[PDB]
């Protein structure tokens, strides 16, 4: 990305305030800096000596260039065999971020097929014609018969000696048709929730994926190590090894532009991103409830009282204050669906007024 650009800038946030609390509690000084790469560190084969080594924050820690790693430490069995840990501050699991947010005219006339309107129109035309012929053969007359034939359908009387059965059957017909239309429109808008999620790690469709299930993880992360030790992930590993991304924002912009379709990530971070971007819904099955702590060296005098200060932060409401900083800090409409309804209403009103102009100009 950049050949040589390393500058002092401003840093703040969650773990920065955690370090401020550690400096407020204990009696020391410090210096804040960043890591060079954007990787956690993996036990990866280097080209010489046939020996796997480390890089990233673990590489700068084992070199002695780092004194205390304050990071979302994915506490695992691999890193504990080499360094010592602290007691965790964050309880946070893993989940799957996908894109199931599919918005919507609600199928009134124009998206739907036009059998119903033409059918009711031809039917009421046949009804009005046979009622006017029964008015001729009675056991503005045509206009009165047509207006009554509309008014029975209108839901808001000529000579019907042998025609009242026809009118009552037509009225029951009109109400049972509009009742069926109301019932199945409400039925379609209630059950409009198909299966669009993954349902956790136990998805056999992702155990043997295809070209649409585009899922990956962070390039050279501890999640890839946790999946690489387990044997039932290897095929998924063969899917994920060719699309691993550097940062989480790369995954955000990828699945937002649908370059991805699923992403394994920490839970509360995706909750905060769902609070930021309202088009992000994670899956339901929470898996691998993990813990974030502080990356530490071996046996050192900054192991006991530091973890005691962490537990002192756990016992009081300072964790709740940190939740108040970032975790708690969150963010028939008839304007899109019934807007075309109003447009067709206004167009029908204008056309009806024009037909009234033609009718007044004729008579």
């Amino acid at each position: 990305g950049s050949p040589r650009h390393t500058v002092p800038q401003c840093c703040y946030g969650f773990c920065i305030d955690l370090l401020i609390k550690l400096a407020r509690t204990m009696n020391f000084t410090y210096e804040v800096h960043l890591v060079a790469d954007g990787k956690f560190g993996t036990q990866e084969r280097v080209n010489n000596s046939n020996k796997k080594e480390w890089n990233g924050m673990m590489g700068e820690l084992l070199s002695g260039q780092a004194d205390m790693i304050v990071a979302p430490l994915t506490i695992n069995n691999e890193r504990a065999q080499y360094i010592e840990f602290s007691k965790p501050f964050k309880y946070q699991g893993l989940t799957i971020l996908v894109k199931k947010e599919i918005p919507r005219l609600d199928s009134f006339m124009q998206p739907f097929q036009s059998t119903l309107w033409l059918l009711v129109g031809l039917s009421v035309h046949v009804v009005a014609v046979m009622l006017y012929l029964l008015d001729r053969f009675s056991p503005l007359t045509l206009s009165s018969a047509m207006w009554f034939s509309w008014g029975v359908l209108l839901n808001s009387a000529p000579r019907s000696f042998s025609a009242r059965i026809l009118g009552m059957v037509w009225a029951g017909f009109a109400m049972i048709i509009v009742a069926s239309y109301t019932a199945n429109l409400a039925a379609f808008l209630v059950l409009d929730r198909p299966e669009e999620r993954i349902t956790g790690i136990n998805d056999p469709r992702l155990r043997n994926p295809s070209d649409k299930f585009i899922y990956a993880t962070v390039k050279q992360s501890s999640v890839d190590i946790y999946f690489r030790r387990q044997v039932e992930l290897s095929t998924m590993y063969r899917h994920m090894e060719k699309h691993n991304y550097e940062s989480a924002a790369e995954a955000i912009q990828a699945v937002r532009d649908n370059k991805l379709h699923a992403f394994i990530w920490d839970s509360a971070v995706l909750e905060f991103e769902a609070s930021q971007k309202c088009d992000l819904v994670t899956t339901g099955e929470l898996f691998f409830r993990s813990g974030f702590g502080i990356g530490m060296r071996k046996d050192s005098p900054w192991k006991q009282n530091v973890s005691l200060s962490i537990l002192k932060s756990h016992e009081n409401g300072f964790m709740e204050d940190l939740d108040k900083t970032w975790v708690r800090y969150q963010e028939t409409l008839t304007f899109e669906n019934m807007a075309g309804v109003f447009m067709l209403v206004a167009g029908g009103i204008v056309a009806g007024i024009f037909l009234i102009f033609i009718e007044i100009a004729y008579k």
Partner: protein
């Protein structure tokens, strides 16, 4: 006393059984790494209740009402033009369209000038739209059941004094428990009102919550979650999942200086790191 009295006085080796972790326990012994997310929570009676049908703002949102008044004005103006082409329906055409919003008004004699029947048919078709939309609005209201929380969390205003509110209530914990020390290190008055509201047994407190002999109860989170998961009738859906709470974990307490720390910690990380947990 107890397991702490056995491990600190070295008559035992380690505390394999379930044990909360706080400050003075970490002072007296050296714990292992935590492995299970066991905070604290509150179990109450939490009966059925209602679905809270407050109001509705879905169709209009205080802006389609302008469209209703504009359509009333248009209908009134065209009715004035029709009756000028053809002496009591100047402002009463507004009432004519306005009582026929809900299609049960007094039937005014409609003119045969072909315009009013067309606009009444258009308004009746719009009525077919919006009564179906209201049935859709209530149909989108009964999707999943709900019950409002009387207590938001540990920072509740009801936790100040139940005499301030018109229903008084009661809250309990376990006697001689670590939750009592967590309260006494945080709130003295909570312990003072808990002292008169004591109890003895976990199943006894469960019966007291079911039979109405106790309103609220404070215990560890995951134990109450498992008790709700095996609940007779499953009428106990607790407030959240332990978000405004202590949010701690369980581990294994070892003696200060035991060489079994690193091996058992690596074994716990192995047991979590393979799905066997």
């Amino acid at each position: 006393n107890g397991m702490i009295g056995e491990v600190v006085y070295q008559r035992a080796v380690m505390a394999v059984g379930s044990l909360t972790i706080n400050e003075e326990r970490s002072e007296v012994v050296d714990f292992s790494v935590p492995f299970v997310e066991t905070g604290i929570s509150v179990m109450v009676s939490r009966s059925n209740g209602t679905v809270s049908p407050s109001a509705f703002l879905e169709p209009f949102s205080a802006s389609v009402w302008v469209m209703m008044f504009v359509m009333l004005l248009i209908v009134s103006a065209i009715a004035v033009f029709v009756f000028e082409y053809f002496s009591f329906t100047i402002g009463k055409a507004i009432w004519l369209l306005w009582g026929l919003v809900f299609n049960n008004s007094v039937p005014v004699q409609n003119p045969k000038g072909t315009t009013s029947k067309i606009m009444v048919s258009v308004w009746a078709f719009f009525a077919v739209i919006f009564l179906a939309s209201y049935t859709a609005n209530l149909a989108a209201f009964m999707i999943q059941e709900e019950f409002v929380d009387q207590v938001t969390g540990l920072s509740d205003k009801k936790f100040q004094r139940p005499h301030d509110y018109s229903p008084p209530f009661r809250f309990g914990t376990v006697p001689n428990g670590s939750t009592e020390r967590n309260i006494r290190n945080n709130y003295p008055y909570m312990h003072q009102y808990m002292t008169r509201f004591n109890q003895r047994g976990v199943e006894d407190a469960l019966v007291s919550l079911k039979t109405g002999k106790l309103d609220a109860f404070i215990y560890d989170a995951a134990v109450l979650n498992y008790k709700a998961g095996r609940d007779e009738g499953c009428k106990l859906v607790t407030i959240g999942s332990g978000y405004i709470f202590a949010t701690t974990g369980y581990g294994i307490a070892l003696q200060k200086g035991s060489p079994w720390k690193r091996q058992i910690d690596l074994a716990l990380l192995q047991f979590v790191g393979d799905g066997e947990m």
